[PDB]
Symmetry: none
């Protein structure tokens, strides 16, 4: 029943008169980056496992979904109930998997490439892994794990060859670097992992350690008067 | 009132469960789908994607509810009430949005550390750290029982090491892989064309044939 409050508040926020913000001037395009922002906040409240945070952040994600439904309903396309109607239909007719729902979504109705309908917005690691699995799905993939590792080693040698040259060709060095990164995604994938998520967790790990070394060096403290690699070591230990 | 219906469908529906993950990666994947549908102004796609997104909000609410954490309507209450309405430690790492691509974000973090004196002075140990991470990853991979959490941890760290290499070599990792993604996709598309021109299905060609085409395509560039 609170959902119904949300819906009318959302209605009343765009009520034209009255209205508003601001809200009134938001479109599908202007809400988009907030949805991106908000989804990572959701994923962060999850990683940190706090549910005070998470219940707030899901509220904000919902607010998003309700915002899109309203803007769609204002053009007569659909409303919130039709969104809930269609997922409910799909989940009923099908628990899960989530892969299943997604792949039969795709099954309509390209035509042409393996390869088509890949969001142009995707972070590079997400996009490489998606390209690779699309190609795997049609049978283009390595069959064993070892040549995958070996392709990483080959691309490292390639990168390092370019880097060693008397005159470094920067474009060619960037190209090899790119193929090395692609190869490492192929390995991540062959290992059962998601490359973009894996690096997100390594980023938080490193950031958490660095922040601690900062806290330690700072508490020291004073010093206008290494240091650093040894504290990094200790913080690494205390973990 | 299909809102009530979806909810009760959640109470009642891989089919293991999971958990806050493996849902969370799905929240990220679906969010890009939603933004793409908005970018391509396709409102039929959009309706479906919002259903997919909504379904995860409901799932999160269901797990939360099972744990006694006040649930789908509190979510609604929370945001409604809100809509009717002390320093952290200082850091060189501040203002790097969570939502940047992971590679771009690793490279940004490493530069902040470099600014402040925390970086390798020579290329040798950067290279070493990559080869060492590949040992640690592959070590976890071939263990009789694979610790999945540790494998992913080491896979992450290898990715972070390879960004450090990219950076010390004067390159931006996220852009470099985008351009590798485009090269790969170009060439696979040619292989798709060549096979279609024989009137075959890609799913009806053996891997050896695929590889020989792939090689012809790559020989057709130089």
């Amino acid at each position: 029943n609170q959902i119904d409050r949300l819906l009318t508040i959302m209605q009343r926020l765009r009520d034209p008169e009255n209205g508003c913000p601001w809200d009134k001037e938001q479109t599908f395009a202007t809400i988009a980056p907030y949805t991106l922002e908000e989804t990572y906040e959701v994923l962060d409240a999850i990683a940190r496992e706090d549910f005070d945070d998470l219940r707030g952040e899901l509220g904000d994600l919902l607010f998003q979904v309700v915002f899109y439904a309203q803007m769609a309903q204002e053009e007569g396309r659909f409303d919130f109930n039709d969104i809930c109607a269609a997922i409910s239909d799909k989940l009923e007719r099908r628990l899960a998997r989530w892969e299943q729902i997604k792949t039969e979504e795709r099954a309509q109705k390209a035509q042409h490439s393996a390869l088509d309908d890949i969001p142009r917005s995707l972070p590079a690691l997400m996009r490489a892994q998606k390209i690779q699995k699309r190609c795997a799905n049609v049978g283009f993939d390595w069959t064993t794990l070892g040549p995958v590792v070996d392709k990483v080693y080959e691309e490292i040698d390639e990168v390092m060859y370019e880097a060693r040259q008397a005159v470094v060709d920067q474009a060619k060095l960037e190209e090899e670097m790119g193929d090395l990164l692609f190869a490492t995604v192929n390995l991540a994938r062959h290992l059962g992992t998601k490359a973009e998520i894996a690096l997100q967790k390594a980023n938080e790990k490193f950031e958490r350690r660095f922040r601690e070394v900062e806290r330690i060096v700072a508490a020291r403290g004073l010093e206008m008067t290494e240091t650093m690699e040894e504290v990094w070591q200790q913080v690494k230990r205390q973990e």
